[PDB]
A paper describes a structure:
In this study, we determined the X-ray structure of TFEα and the cryo-EM structures of three forms of archaeal RNAP, including the apo-form, RNAP–TFEα binary complex, and RNAP–TFEα–DNA ternary complex. The structures reveal that direct binding of TFEα can shift the clamp conformation from a closed conformation to an open conformation. Our results support the universally conserved mechanisms of transcription initiation in all three domains of life by showing that direct binding of TFEα, a conserved GTF in archaeal-eukaryal RNAP systems, can open the clamp of the stalk-containing RNAPs.
After screening derivatives of TFEα, we found that the 13 kDa fragment Pfu TFEα (TFEαΔZRD, 1–110 amino acid residues) was crystallized. The structure was solved by a single wavelength anomalous dispersion (SAD) at 3.2 Å and the resolution of the structure was improved to 2.6 Å with a native crystal. There were eight molecules in the asymmetric unit of the SAD structure and two molecules in the asymmetric unit of the native structure. The TFEαΔZRD structure consists of the N-terminal eWHD (residues 5–86) and a long α-helix (α5) that connects the eWHD and the ZRD. Superposition of the globular part of the eWHD from the 10 crystallographically independent structures (average root-mean-square deviation in α-carbon positions are 0.369–0.589 Å over residues 8–62) reveal flexibilities in the wing and the α5 linker. The conformation of the wing can change about 24° (~13 Å), and the α5 can be bent at ~21° (~12 Å) for the eWHD. These results show a potential structural adaptability of TFEα during the transcription initiation process.
Author numbering: 8 to 109
């Protein structure tokens, strides 16, 4: 599960912890992950949005009926996880191709 090697490049130990706990749980809210990990709830959100732009996490949106506002259930995005992996392999090869051109 080379997923952790990427998350680490975005936001270090905290990001690796968030993915591992999300991986352990399957799905989690922003607040649920903050309690599990001890990271400020504000920081988990930047992670998740960072992970979302890195295409390693997606979500489905549920509407909280008490407040009328939405909250997200995060998940690791395995639909694009293999594509993200595949791009990383391709980027490394392209780095090698430039060397053969040295």
């Amino acid at each position: 599960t080379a997923l952790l090697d990427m998350a680490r490049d975005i936001g270090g130990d905290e990001a690796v912890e968030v993915v591992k706990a999300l991986e352990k749980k399957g799905e989690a809210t922003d607040e649920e992950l903050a309690e599990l990990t001890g990271v400020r709830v504000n920081t988990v959100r930047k992670m998740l949005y960072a992970l979302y732009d890195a295409k390693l996490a997606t979500m489905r949106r549920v509407r909280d009926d008490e407040t009328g506002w939405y909250y997200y259930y995060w998940r690791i995005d395995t639909k694009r996880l293999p594509e993200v992996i595949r791009t990383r392999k391709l980027q490394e090869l392209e780095k090698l191709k430039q060397m053969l051109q040295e």
